Write a protein that binds this ligand. Structure first.
Ligand SMILES: COc1cccc(CN2C[C@@H](C(=O)N[C@@H](Cc3ccccc3)[C@H](O)CNCc3cccc(N(C)C)c3)NC2=O)c1
Ligand SMILES: [Cl-]
Ligand SMILES: [Cl-]
Ligand SMILES: [Cl-]
Ligand SMILES: [Cl-]
Ligand SMILES: [Cl-]
Length: 379
């Protein structure tokens, strides 16, 4: 088995807070575009018409292999939205596996709060499941096509590396790079194939249990989404966590506006008091019954740096109304394997994650845990 994907390592770039993107080409001849890797979506969409924030776009009339599906589509995100027309064309991933597949493409022609100013990406690659793709489930997502058409295993892995202003990382398509992690890989089942839904069974702050019905941890749902920057948490859980994180960091008090992400905090260049902030742990349901494992992040993860003579950051743990979102603040600590064939998601300490001399993120297990099925929410 291949354990070294030399060509795919370091194929991701991005700017802090604006997502990670991979270079792709569409059309004949190939048109190069930077695409946002978003495991919280299932639509492959690219800018397909002029827009001030786009350095370049997809020109359908210049592609021989272009085909119009003669159908429209729009997609509402959390705050940004776009509208386009469906079609298909050949697509590639230069620094990915050497193959060219035909996939569905939403040519974006109208958008709002979508493309960012100077983001450097021009499209979005939703890697989730068909179940949530617009217009409806019959529009086969990109990864699904790539799989049926080539001999690439049904699985991709992601190592997102923060920093402390250009992020990086690698998206290994079809396999697992042993160079990207240390220790062992722990798997949590994928509850349902729509978003990448998992189940959190216990939460800890510097070792101290949050002590809540574990149903509150997955209230609505919990998903791994590289398309979200923060560690979004349900209203009730978010409340408990900030109280705890505040008690733990009490050596220094901060304006209520910090804990709300509204305002950032600063410290003399390189004197950030990391040690005063607690570590955060999430126990995920493991594969064997009554077994769970633990993933732990550091302030370096949830205190996202933001562009003086100081190092400033903003709190990256926000409240959410739609369940828990394990955003980049979570992901950046691990090498995350989206083993789709075996309906599970693996976590391992990331070999690039940002940390100081004394602490490191971690993944430990197993922990004898009972009654985990009831940690999941149902309609
Ligand atoms: C990817 O990192 C980022 C890049 C730019 C901006 C941001 C900030 N915001 C955007 C925001 C947000 O809208 N995130 C979605 C991806 C995205 C990024 C930037 C612009 C537009 C869309 C992500 O897919 C959300 N997943 C849950 C979700 C919500 C609503 C609808 C769906 N569907 C239809 C399946 C799915 N998440 C953020 O954290 C993050
Ligand atoms: Cl090897
Ligand atoms: Cl390779
Ligand atoms: Cl269609
Ligand atoms: Cl729009
Ligand atoms: Cl420190």
């Amino acid at each position: 088995k291949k354990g070294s994907f030399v060509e795919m390592v370091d194929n991701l770039r991005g700017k802090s807070g604006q997502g990670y993107y991979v270079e792709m080409t569409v059309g004949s001849p190939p048109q190069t575009l930077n695409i946002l890797v978003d495991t919280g979506s299932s639509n492959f969409a690219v800018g397909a018409a002029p827009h001030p924030f786009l350095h370049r776009y997809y020109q359908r009339q210049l592609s021989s292999t272009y085909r119009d599906l003669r159908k429209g589509v729009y997609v509402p995100y959390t705050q940004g939205k776009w509208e386009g027309e469906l079609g298909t064309d050949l697509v590639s991933i230069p620094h990915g596996p050497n193959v060219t597949v035909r996939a569905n493409i939403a040519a974006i022609t109208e958008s709002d709060k979508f493309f960012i100013n100077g983001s450097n990406w021009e499209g979005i690659l939703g890697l989730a499941y068909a179940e949530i793709a617009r217009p409806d489930d019959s529009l086969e997502p990109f990864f699904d096509s790539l799989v049926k058409q080539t001999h690439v295993p049904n699985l991709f892995s992601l190592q997102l590396c923060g920093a402390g202003a250009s992020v990086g990382g690698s998206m290994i398509i079809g396999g697992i790079d042993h160079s990207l992690y240390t220790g062992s890989l722990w798997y949590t089942p994928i509850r349902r194939e729509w978003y990448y839904e998992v189940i959190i069974v216990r939460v800890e702050i510097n070792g101290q249990d949050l002590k809540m019905d574990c149903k509150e941890y997955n209230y609505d749902k919990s998903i791994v989404d590289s398309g979200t920057t923060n560690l979004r948490l349900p209203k009730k859980v978010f409340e408990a966590a900030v109280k705890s994180i505040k008690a733990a960091s009490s050596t220094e008090k901060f304006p209520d506006g910090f804990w709300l992400g509204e305002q950032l905090v600063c410290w003399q260049a390189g004197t950030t008091p990391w040690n005063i902030f607690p570590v955060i742990s999430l126990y995920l349901m493991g594969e064997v019954t009554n077994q769970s494992f633990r993933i732990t992040i550091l302030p370096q993860q949830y205190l996202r740096p933001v562009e003086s003579q100081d190092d400033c950051y903003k709190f990256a743990i926000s409240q959410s109304s739609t369940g828990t979102v394990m955003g980049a603040v979570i992901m950046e600590g691990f090498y995350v394997v989206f083993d789709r064939a075996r309906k599970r998601i693996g976590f391992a300490v990331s070999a690039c994650h940002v940390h100081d001399e004394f602490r490191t993120a971690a993944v430990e297990g197993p922990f004898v845990t009972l009654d985990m099925e009831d940690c999941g929410y149902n309609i």
